[PDB]
Amino acid sequence: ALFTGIIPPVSTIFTADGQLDKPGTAALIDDLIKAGVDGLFFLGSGGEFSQLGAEERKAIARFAIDHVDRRVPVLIGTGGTNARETIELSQHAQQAGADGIVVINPYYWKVSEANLIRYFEQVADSVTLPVMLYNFPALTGQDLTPALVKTLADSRSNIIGIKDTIDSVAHLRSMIHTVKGAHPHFTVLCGYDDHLFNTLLLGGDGAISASGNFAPQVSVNLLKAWRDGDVAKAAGYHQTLLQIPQMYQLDTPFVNVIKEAIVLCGRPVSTHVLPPASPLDEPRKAQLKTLLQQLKLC
Amino acid sequence: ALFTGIIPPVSTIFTADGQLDKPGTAALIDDLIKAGVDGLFFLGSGGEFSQLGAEERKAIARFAIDHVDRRVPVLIGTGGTNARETIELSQHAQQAGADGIVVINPYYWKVSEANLIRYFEQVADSVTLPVMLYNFPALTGQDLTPALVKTLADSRSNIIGIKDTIDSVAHLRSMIHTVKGAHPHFTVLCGYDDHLFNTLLLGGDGAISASGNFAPQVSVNLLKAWRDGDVAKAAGYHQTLLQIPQMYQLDTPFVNVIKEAIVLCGRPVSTHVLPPASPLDEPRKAQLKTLLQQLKLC
Amino acid sequence: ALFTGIIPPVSTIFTADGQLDKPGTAALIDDLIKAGVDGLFFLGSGGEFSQLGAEERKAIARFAIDHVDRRVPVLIGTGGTNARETIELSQHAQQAGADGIVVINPYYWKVSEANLIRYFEQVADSVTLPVMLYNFPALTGQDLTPALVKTLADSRSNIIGIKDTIDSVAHLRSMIHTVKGAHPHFTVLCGYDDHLFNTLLLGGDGAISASGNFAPQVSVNLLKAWRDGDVAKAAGYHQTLLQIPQMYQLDTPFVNVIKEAIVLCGRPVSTHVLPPASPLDEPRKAQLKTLLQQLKLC
Amino acid sequence: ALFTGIIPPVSTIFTADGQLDKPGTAALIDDLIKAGVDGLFFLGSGGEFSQLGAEERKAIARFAIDHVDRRVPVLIGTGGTNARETIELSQHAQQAGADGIVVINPYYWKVSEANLIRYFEQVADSVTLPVMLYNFPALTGQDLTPALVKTLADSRSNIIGIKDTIDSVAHLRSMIHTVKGAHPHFTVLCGYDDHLFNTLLLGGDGAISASGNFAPQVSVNLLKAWRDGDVAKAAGYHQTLLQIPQMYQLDTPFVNVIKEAIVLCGRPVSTHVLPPASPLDEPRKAQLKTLLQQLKLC
Ligand SMILES: *[C@H](C[C@H](O)C=O)C(=O)O
Ligand SMILES: *[C@H](C[C@H](O)C=O)C(=O)O
Ligand SMILES: [Mg+2]
Ligand SMILES: [Mg+2]
Ligand SMILES: [Mg+2]
Ligand SMILES: [Mg+2]
């Protein structure tokens, strides 16, 4: 099974004038590798793919791949609505040296099931990389159902996992039973911090979740405790992860919150976010701070 | 805090000719008390309140109260759409000797916020009993939001808890922070088996969930282990509770599944259900059986 | 085709104690007959069926059928969640002299397709009367799709129409194409005032809508103009029906608004509504009066 | 009021390689001008904006604007998720000679109300052109409510209308009452063929709808009839518009259907569509032909 464990959706650090901040992104990447994560995911939702142009995304991905320098597996988010661009971005990722791509379903038009299957098959045909699907129905308005995902895994042998971003134990459970039941090494990762523990206990593989940016140790240490058989210890970290997502209510999008938390937790980076996100106000920054203090994370 | 712990939503046992089955309902109640539950809830969703007439509900509640004979706390479900009938049923429950009532929001019309608050205030004024609210937005089409619930707790001192039936860690989390933050002894119970463990870890109080009918020991032992500080043991029961809700997919309504599970787990009762539910077919009964066998519950 | 044309969901008039007001209700019935309606529907949503007990409903149906005295066809709404009661109510209706029954899908549990089909078949097999289906997905949480309705019409020759209460031209169009396509005499009536014109232009049959109570002349005149071939005239009445639903925004439920509108348009009936509805307050009563004035309805 | 009457979301014609087909597109533009439309809208949903890259969109807009050569007003759709691109595309549009821009709400993240208001204000402040808002909640997952649209019109004097793409008479009615009430010259256009008549009757201004492409005469004639006072005639055309959207059920996305319909109604343009849309298959082409024949459009 590929891309298991803790794989943060890495924030892209931008300068005050909206440019890729290479020193700050590079520092964050190094912090996360030092924290013992099992891979890194660039240009996910949290990485602001949807507010970046295609050439911008290529530049980011190349930089991030090159900086990681094969120390851990790298995933690149190459999706969007423009299917031709998805193929371009995904071929570019393979050419630049990525280890896999993560592809959401198109999220403007909710295309027919035939078109959707076709789309994923075409993307998967465009590269020899492993492809991780990305379900986020609260944003896409179209669920990648367990049956559909199994149909995709059946169709293309490089469709090898999913980031299932949904506050649903049933959806995770059923994704695992249905897809992993047919394909024991297909990877199921949850997209929310507070579902990591359950995802493991259900027979899934890990998480790609925002707290990997500012508190990776909590997930890293949970996974380690789980793999060590120290279930009580894992449960202790879970209690923390249960509380973290309160923070994400502070704004929408909450990309600003995540970057502010990176700062509060000891890594000073520019917190600039791309429109239509906006900077987090001071009152909510302090609120973030008290939540992190309460959980003993800064 | 009232009505904490494990409180099953007791199935009502009916004869083949659709009458209350007093011997079978009584045996079930006795099994559950023997298993160490903290209370019993009759005429919940699982108890088929919505398929029974008001006089039928009164007869059932009186029998059940009298059979329990004060051995554990008794809750009666008295809700519906007819508000005058809610008050009648609720006063009848107090007069018959119930320890509390559970009231869902009206679920045909989703009334205005003003009318909703008013409705709950009138119901709560009609009785001196403790009132537990019942959120089930998948069926009602109208969420009892944490803010609303706190407004209710603020308004009437006998509105003292909630059964929150939703596959959502966020909703449980926010119910707890918001309402228990203002009212530390307000009771939060989840309505799904697979949310008990998280509910406790979040600072909530228990569950009213269907598996309490056929496998109460799992929840009872989880709660006991949590209270003993044996987290790893609690997590072990949780792993079981994570899988149980697969069963409930076997039909809709799944009241038939629950009663079939009661039988398979060692209590032989008529499994008759009221229309528009229907008897579980033999193939699906066997499927239920293999699920219970796999979880080592029969 | 049975039950075509303008069929008001007649308001139930109650005294302050919540009991049936026979002179008030009778007067309203006589007003509507006199206005040229094609039929009368008692105990629909607007008639407060979901806030009445079974015995209360039977009394109301009996009285209304008896007052109408066969001057126009009479429909009784017999639905609920309690399917045994649905059968008792429907048989009671047939016995009491109704011309047909109107049955909504159970709206607590959204039952499986198999259970839903069976329910409707069982209700239709319980009477020799014609049965109109009732779709109100905003309230039920479960749409009666044109395919499902076709399946029901294919299955039982006494399932002979539908009240399609949805603000959707697509739904009405598809209902008419899919069901009337297969059953040319199946009746399709919209449930909203502002969809009558379109319903008729689409090949549908009329409306059961709330403004039937206080301004039946608009709908009766629209239909007469249409049947007479004066489409410009019909469109003129439609322009008024397009504006009327403004008023229903004044409260939820809006059965209070409908009765105050009956008063304001010249029929002094008691405006009492059953909980959890409540009295329309004086500012909103004044807004309603102003609206009715602007539309030339009082 | 700006941009009133019939303004087609013009189809973008491509060669098989997915590049702009200039003779095809030009011919379609000329057909539509020749049919009496009041304006032309390029790179709406029907124009495939969401499957095109930014440089491609600029090329297309430049070409279209230039071909129209000021014969009718020209709207360019400039939205997306990337707000910096939105500004660049809108400024490009103004520079290129467009009369106005059409901006949808960001449809990945459904941004907070503060962020959304800010977005639209920032986009409106980036140009001196008039700005039409674009509401398509079925696809965006986030409704531009009449209250929000009013707030936008109150905030910026160049936010001057909306394309309200929703199958809802209530939404259109309220949009018109809430916004045009405060801003009598604010333009309200429906986005669906079957709501044009009702839109005009409600006090609104016209339609941006797909049948503008292959049957512009129906809408143009309807509007002429209405403006002439011949409401019966207008209703006649409406009766065709009511039936047209049947065809859009043939595929999702249905941009393929629209181009095949342009071919079948006498204009042989290439029907290529960008992925993830795909070619309409021959059986469905034959159903489409049959439908257009039945409606007397070819
Ligand atoms: C994954 C995490 C999740 O979708 C929260 O936003 C990501 O790509 O950010
Ligand atoms: C409560 C349990 C929960 O609703 C499971 O379905 C009940 O009243 O049945
Ligand atoms: Mg993220
Ligand atoms: Mg239950
Ligand atoms: Mg009504
Ligand atoms: Mg279009």
Side-chain angles (χ1 to χ4, degrees), chain C residues 9 45-46 163 209-210 258:
Chain C
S45 302
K163 179 182 174 183
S209 65
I258 298 159

Coordinates of all heavy atoms in Angstrom, one line a residue, chain C residues 9 45-46 163 209-210 258, ligand 5:
Chain C
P9 N -57.1 23.2 -1.2 CA -56.7 22.6 0.0 C -57.4 23.4 1.1 O -56.8 24.4 1.6 CB -55.2 22.6 0.1 CG -54.9 23.9 -0.7 CD -56.0 24.2 -1.6
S45 N -52.1 19.7 3.8 CA -51.1 20.4 4.7 C -51.8 21.6 5.3 O -51.7 21.9 6.5 CB -49.8 20.8 4.0 OG -49.3 19.6 3.4
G46 N -52.4 22.4 4.4 CA -53.1 23.6 4.7 C -54.3 23.5 5.6 O -54.7 24.4 6.4
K163 N -50.7 15.4 -6.5 CA -50.5 16.8 -6.1 C -49.0 17.0 -5.9 O -48.5 16.5 -5.0 CB -51.2 17.1 -4.8 CG -51.0 18.5 -4.3 CD -51.7 18.7 -2.9 CE -51.3 20.1 -2.5 NZ -51.7 20.5 -1.2
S209 N -54.0 24.6 -4.4 CA -53.1 25.6 -3.9 C -53.8 26.5 -2.9 O -55.0 26.7 -3.0 CB -52.3 26.4 -5.0 OG -53.1 27.1 -5.8
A210 N -53.0 27.1 -2.0 CA -53.6 27.8 -0.8 C -54.5 29.0 -1.1 O -55.5 29.3 -0.4 CB -52.5 28.2 0.1
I258 N -52.9 32.2 5.7 CA -54.0 31.8 4.8 C -55.4 32.2 5.5 O -56.2 32.9 4.8 CB -54.0 30.4 4.4 CG1 -52.6 30.1 3.6 CG2 -55.2 29.9 3.6 CD1 -52.3 28.6 3.6
Ligands
MG5 MG -51.8 24.4 1.5

